[PDB]
Amino acid sequence: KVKLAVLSYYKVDAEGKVTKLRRECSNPTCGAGVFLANHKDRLYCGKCHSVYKVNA
Amino acid sequence: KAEVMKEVIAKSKFYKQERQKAQGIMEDQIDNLDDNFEDVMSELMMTQPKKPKTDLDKEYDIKVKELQLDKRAAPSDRTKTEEEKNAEAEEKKRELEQQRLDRMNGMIELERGVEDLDDGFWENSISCPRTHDALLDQVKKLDLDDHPKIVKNIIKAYQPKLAEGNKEKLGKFTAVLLRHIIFLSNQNYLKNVQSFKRTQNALISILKSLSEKYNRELSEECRDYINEMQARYKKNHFDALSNGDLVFFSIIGIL
Amino acid sequence: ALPEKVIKAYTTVGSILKTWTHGKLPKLFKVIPSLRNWQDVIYVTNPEEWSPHVVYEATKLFVSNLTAKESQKFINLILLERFRDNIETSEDHSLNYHIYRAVKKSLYKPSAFFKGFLFPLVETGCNVREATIAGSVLAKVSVPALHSSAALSYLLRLPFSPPTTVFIKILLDKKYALPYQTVDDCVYYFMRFRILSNGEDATRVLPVIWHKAFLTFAQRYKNDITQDQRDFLLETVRQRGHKDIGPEIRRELLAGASR
Amino acid sequence: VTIEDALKVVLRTALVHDGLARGLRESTKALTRGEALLVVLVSSVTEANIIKLVEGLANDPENKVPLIKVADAKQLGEWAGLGKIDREGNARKVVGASVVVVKNWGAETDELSMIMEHFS
RNA sequence: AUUGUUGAUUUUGUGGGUGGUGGUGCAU
Ligand SMILES: [Zn+2]
């Protein structure tokens, strides 16, 4: 179990700007807001189960 | 017959290998499809298409929330007829008396017999008080006639359904309650015999209801008292004995 | 049309699904719900040739992944049609064991199931055997009280048909904490069957299933109706009461207290 | 009609059309997709990072979304519909909601005009 | 809470009704 996992995805600077620390899934059905889990060798989508390379 | 059997066994084996062969080819293509998965999925993603509720669907969603706003009714079961209730009650009475007769004649519920036991015997907000003293502190400032009120509330405040572990707490409270019933009898009550009579029997009635559900905890405490009282008798003899000891034996007969 | 390379791939998948019975499903099949045009992709996999085993695994896959709106179309277009076809085509008019589990898994998403399986079925000439089989699935699996009450309010307002009565009886038998708005609707549904100006429902002959449903409501929700409502229901019994069930309904209604 | 009373009906109307995102995760997802029309946030959130995140997202230049301040999460959860109702009718077993985002108003009400007018 | 990312559909504790895609004959 992970608590406040959503908080970890985003970083807020002192001026209130919001920056995304994780990449979003390119599948249109996933659309925006669907974040790829960062594994050592791949990026994994929890919704589509698609796999992307980390440096692609 | 034997020839017919050998044909049947041969056919069954013949079909079994065919099914196994069918399963064998089944995994082969699935492996091939998995290998070709990445090539296939890519073209699908290249050709993915670009981006009103039915009135019935609108109504159903509207119903869901309005039902949420509504209060919820409690359910009820069928009322058994008076003849059925009497028949069921009579059946339960008949079963219980029969078990009592069997236990009287030596039936022991581990369904063993007394003779079995005779082998080798001769050869060799509201706080739930886990201890008797705790209950006194909670009821320290209350009058004698208020003890049933506080004792009943503790049971209500810690019913099994309210939270996990309440069965254990109530189980111990059954043991604690018994010591309280014996404890009060020791204390002088000639001043307010009427008040003591209203509290002592009331607490016993509460203990009976608890004993129906938590006889095991009560049974352990009851045996402990017998050993403790025996130990006191070894030293003080009759001085150890008190009014509560007479009361205690009386309660055991009830429960 | 899909890419000609894909259609061959998913054409091959459909062949596997026709005779699949166990093991792991094809990887291409498992990713269909993610695709936007899953209706087109599912079409080439030829669903009405899906084996009963595939329908069960398919139902698990699509109900969990698709949205509520999309899961509705899967239930309505595939699971419902397959459910009807199997009953119609089977010699004994029974439902295959794997399809029977598929309906249960669809029920995991109550909103999609009711508006995709139940309401379309009763509104599209459901027969008694179809209702009984579906009613058992609804009877055994747990449904939320809120969603179940909404469905019960829905069925009560529909035109009377013995198939619809069965679903009405099943929901009542479940012993839900029906909201008082639903209870009022239950009274109105039975109230409209009493003779007075009124429609044919007053004079329409009543099967036993209606009486059994009316008995169940009396047995379970007698303590949750107003005294005026109790009088109306009693008015219904004297007019339309059954020979044997009617006396028991009268006993149960009278034994209840007003809310 | 106070602003708080206005939001009570507005949020309920959003619920009837399935137009509310309840929770931090759904609120963040709604904002980044541009599906957010209004943001309701709680002042008594223990972790200031939650306040900073929603404030930054709600104040993004591309999609400026109005933001509202709520004293207690528990009452916001009650407006979100999380809690259930008793035999008495009072809300029971209510769940605190830190953030609520409205995706669809569902129906036009005078109370929707007032809250928009207050922001303008 | 939980599903396989998802959103209250579940999980936990205490109670608890149910024989039911049951058969087989009978009476339009
Ligand atoms: Zn994807």
Q: Domains plus CATH for chain D?
A: 1-120 (3.30.1330.30)
Residue for token pair 């069930």: C245
Neighbours of B205 (CB within 10 A): 12
Inter-chain contact A28–B48, Cβ cutoff 8 Å?
A: yes
Phi, psi of B240, rounded to the nearest 5 degrees: -65, -40
State the Cα–Cα distance between residues A41 and A55, nearest whole angstrom. 9
The dihedral region occupied by D96, where left means phi > 0, alpha psi between -120 and 50, and beta the remainder, is beta
State the Cα–Cα distance between residues C32 and C13, nearest whole angstrom. 12
Near-strand E residues (CB closer than 7 A): A 1, 34-35, 37, 45-47; B 77, 160-161, 164, 167, 213; C 60, 64-65, 67, 94-95, 97, 100, 108-110, 132-133, 136, 139, 142-144, 146; D 22-23, 25-26, 29
State the Cα–Cα distance between residues B3 and C215, nearest whole angstrom. 63
Q: Which residue stretches of chain D are H helix?
A: 3-16, 24-32, 48-58, 73-80, 110-119
C-beta of residue C139 within 8 angstroms of C-beta of residue C170:
yes
Q: Which nucleotides of E are covered by protein (CB under 7 A)?
A: 1, 3-10, 12-15, 17, 20-21
C-beta of residue C11 within 8 angstroms of C-beta of residue B33:
no
Neighbours of D67 (CB within 10 A): 15
State the Cα–Cα distance between residues D24 and C252, nearest whole angstrom. 50
Which chains reach chain A with 3 or more Cβ–Cβ distances below 8 angstroms? Answer: B, C, D
Distance (Å) of CA B44 to CA B49, C33, C41, C46: 9, 13, 10, 18
- Taking one residue from B and the other from D, the number of pairs with CB-CB distance under 8 angstroms is 20
Q: Reduced to 3 states, what is the DSSP secondary structure of residue B19?
A: helix
Q: Which structure tokens are listed for C102?
A: 């598929």
Pairing of strands D99-102, D91-92: unpaired
Residue type, D99: V
Closest alpha carbon to C1' of E4, residue: C64
State the Cα–Cα distance between residues C95 and C76, nearest whole angstrom. 17
**Interior/surface letters C48-63, b for 16+ CB within 10 angstroms, e for the rest:** eebbbbbbbbbbebbb
Nearest-Å Rg of the Cα atoms of chain C is: 22
State the Cα–Cα distance between residues C126 and C135, nearest whole angstrom. 12
C-beta of residue A24 within 8 angstroms of C-beta of residue A35:
yes
- D99 by Cβ neighbours in 10 Å (0-12 / 13-18 / 19+) ranks as buried
Q: Give the CA dihedral B198, B201, B202, B206, nearest 10 degrees.
A: 170
Nearest CA in chain C to A49: C31
Q: Chain C within 8 Å of B37 (Cβ-Cβ)?
A: yes
Within 8 A by CB and 6+ apart from B231, the residues are none
The dihedral region occupied by B108, where left means phi > 0, alpha psi between -120 and 50, and beta the remainder, is beta
Neighbours of B41 (CB within 10 A): 20
Inter-chain contact A29–C36, Cβ cutoff 8 Å?
A: yes
Which chains reach chain B with 3 or more Cβ–Cβ distances below 8 angstroms? Answer: A, C, D
Q: Which residue stretches of chain C are H helix?
A: 4-19, 27-30, 38-44, 52-65, 68-74, 80-89, 97-106, 110-113, 119-122, 128-140, 145-157, 162-173, 180-191, 208-221, 227-240, 245-255
Nearest CA distance, B70 vs chain C (angstrom): 6
State the Cα–Cα distance between residues A36 and B47, nearest whole angstrom. 22
- B43 by Cβ neighbours in 10 Å (0-12 / 13-18 / 19+) ranks as middle
Helix (H) or strand (E) holding B11: helix B2-35
* C-alpha B34 chain-centroid distance: 52
- B218 by Cβ neighbours in 10 Å (0-12 / 13-18 / 19+) ranks as buried
State the Cα–Cα distance between residues B176 and B129, nearest whole angstrom. 7
- Chain B residues with CB under 8 Å of D18 CB are 61
Å between CA of C184 and C1' of E27? 40
Q: Which structure tokens are listed for D61?
A: 């230049």
Inter-chain contact B75–C16, Cβ cutoff 8 Å?
A: no
Å between CA of B23 and C1' of E20? 36
Neighbours of ion ligand 1 (CB under 5 A): A 25, 27, 30, 45, 48, 50
Find residue A44's DSSP bridge partners: A37, A51
Which of B143, B218, B154, B231 is CA-nearest to residue B182? B218
C-beta of residue A11 within 8 angstroms of C-beta of residue A23:
no
Q: Chain D within 8 Å of A37 (Cβ-Cβ)?
A: no
DSSP characters over D63-81: S---EEEES-HHHHHHHHT
Distance (Å) of CA B228 to CA B129, B204, D41: 21, 21, 64
Which of C47, C101, C119 is CA-nearest to residue C78? C47
Helices B193-213 and B215-236: crossing angle in degrees, nearest 10, is 130
The CA-based angle B148-B152-B153, given to 5 degrees, is: 120
State the Cα–Cα distance between residues B24 and B31, nearest whole angstrom. 11
DSSP 8-state code for residue C259 = -
Which of A11, A12, A31, A33 is CA-nearest to residue A21? A11
Q: Chain B within 8 Å of A27 (Cβ-Cβ)?
A: yes
Which of A33, B73, B18, B143 is CA-nearest to residue C222? B73
Q: Reduced to 3 states, what is the DSSP secondary structure of residue B76?
A: coil
Å between CA of D18 and C1' of E7? 13
Å between CA of B33 and C1' of E13? 48
State the Cα–Cα distance between residues C139 and C143, nearest whole angstrom. 9
Helix (H) or strand (E) holding A11: strand A10-12
Structural domain for C69, as ranges: 48-186
Greatest alpha-carbon span in chain C: 72
Inter-chain contact D53–A33, Cβ cutoff 8 Å?
A: no
C-beta of residue A27 within 8 angstroms of C-beta of residue B45:
yes
State the Cα–Cα distance between residues B184 and B199, nearest whole angstrom. 9
Method: cryo-EM
Nearest nucleotide to C87 (CA to C1') is E21
C-beta of residue D24 within 8 angstroms of C-beta of residue D77:
no
Pairing of strands D38-42, D67-70: parallel
Nearest nucleotide to C175 (CA to C1') is E17
Q: Which structure tokens are listed for B157?
A: 């405040």
How far away, in angstroms, is C39 Cα from ligand 1 center? Answer: 17
State the Cα–Cα distance between residues B103 and B111, nearest whole angstrom. 10
